Design a binder for this molecule. Structure first.
Ligand SMILES: O=c1[nH]cc(F)c(=O)[nH]1
Ligand SMILES: [Zn+2]
Ligand SMILES: [Zn+2]
Length: 362
């Protein structure tokens, strides 16, 4: 029989609009979200132009309100120049994103003093999330401690990183983290199939011991989040391949397969794709919204899923069990067995809902 799930939330997607709309756009990316059982997305700021100032945020808001099919919030991006400038618009964003390592990003902050300046100037009650790999996780945690506030670590991929976060949580430090499906379901073993172009992602694919360590430390993982990072196959297979994988349409099917194999419970899944995203990012509930899944249907991931403009997937050939049958978003059928039924522009900026503002002391 079907199982009804609440509206799932992905706090880490790249929708590529503005400036990279051949890779994705709000319409195609949120179509891919609905097809993956996702009714609310938080979109990263590494677009063209990047969302690193009030005018770029206003532009992206309209673009999102016109093209998004599911609901959304938009990240602001930290830059080497905008610390202390974001106070009037900070509350309207999903949170502040820091790029602390090299990746598909023009926003790297090279001095730790720039990190501190952001942690000090960004309103302390609003989320800060970091792309922070290996020792950079410990470095950014230190900055959070010096500035006495929380931090959220994006796509944790390594035994090294999850064990460090585990030690920090055991000392009572306010740190949360997310893990992406490719770091749970792929590894070095797959680089031969993928090749060095397709296989290019940051954080890179881990060893089998990295993958095993994340599964063993499920209790340390607060959120699953796709880091949906679409690029075209041409780009992935070209001279300088940009890192990243598309993932909205495969994330939930992969995770449902793990559930059916007894590797985690349905509750563990709902904690990490609904409750914890809500509470870490202060995201509002979605009225009359739910996802119906079929845990019985077995299928094989094809060479590309229907909706993402990436038109490729590193999970090709994996056998999954579990499929999104229907999604209702705020009282409308949004998706059924491969058909997206709400138009571009149906989706709304949740930070403009009364319940979607982050509460704060006057
Ligand atoms: O972390 C990321 N890697 C690659 C990307 F294209 C992107 O948007 N984000
Ligand atoms: Zn990243
Ligand atoms: Zn990302």
């Amino acid at each position: 029989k079907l199982v009804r799930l609440p509206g799932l939330i992905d706090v880490h997607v790249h929708l590529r609009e503005p400036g990279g709309t051949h890779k994705e756009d709000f319409a195609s990316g949120t179509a891919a979200a609905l097809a993956g059982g996702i009714t609310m997305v938080c979109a990263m700021p590494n677009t063209r132009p990047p969302i690193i100032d009030a005018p770029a945020l206003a532009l992206a808001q309209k673009l999102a309100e016109a093209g998004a099919r599911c609901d959304f919030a938009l990240f602001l991006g930290a830059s080497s120049e905008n610390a202390g400038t974001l106070g009037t618009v900070a509350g309207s964003a999903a949170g502040l994103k820091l790029y602390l390592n090299e990746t598909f990003s023009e926003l790297r902050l090279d001095s730790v003093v720039q990190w501190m300046e952001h942690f000090e100037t960004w309103p302390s009650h609003l989320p800060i999330v970091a792309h922070a790999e290996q020792q950079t996780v410990a470095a950014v945690l230190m900055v959070a401690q010096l500035t006495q506030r929380s931090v959220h670590i994006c796509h944790v991929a390594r035994k090294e990183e999850i064990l460090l976060i585990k030690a920090a949580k055991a000392r009572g430090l306010p740190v949360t983290c997310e893990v992406a499906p490719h770091h749970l379901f792929l590894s070095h073993d797959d680089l031969e199939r993928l090749g060095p172009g397709k296989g290019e992602v940051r954080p890179e694919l881990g060893s089998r011991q990295d993958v095993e360590a994340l599964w063993e430390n499920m209790a340390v993982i607060d959120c699953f989040a796709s880091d949906h990072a679409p690029h075209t196959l041409e780009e992935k297979c070209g001279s300088r391949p940009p890192p990243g994988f598309p993932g909205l349409e495969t994330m939930l099917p992969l995770l449902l397969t793990a559930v059916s194999e007894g590797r985690l419970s349905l509750d563990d899944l709902l904690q990490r794709l609904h409750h914890n995203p809500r509470r870490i990012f202060h995201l509002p509930p979605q009225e009359d919204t739910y996802v119906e899944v079929d845990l019985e249907h077995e299928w094989t991931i094809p060479s590309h899923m229907p909706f993402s403009k990436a038109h490729w997937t590193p999970f090709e050939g994996q056998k999954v069990k579990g499929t999104v049958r229907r999604v209702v978003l705020r009282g409308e059928v949004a998706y059924i067995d491969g058909q997206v039924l709400v138009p571009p522009g149906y989706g709304q900026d949740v930070r403009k809902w009364p319940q979607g503002a982050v509460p704060q002391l006057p």
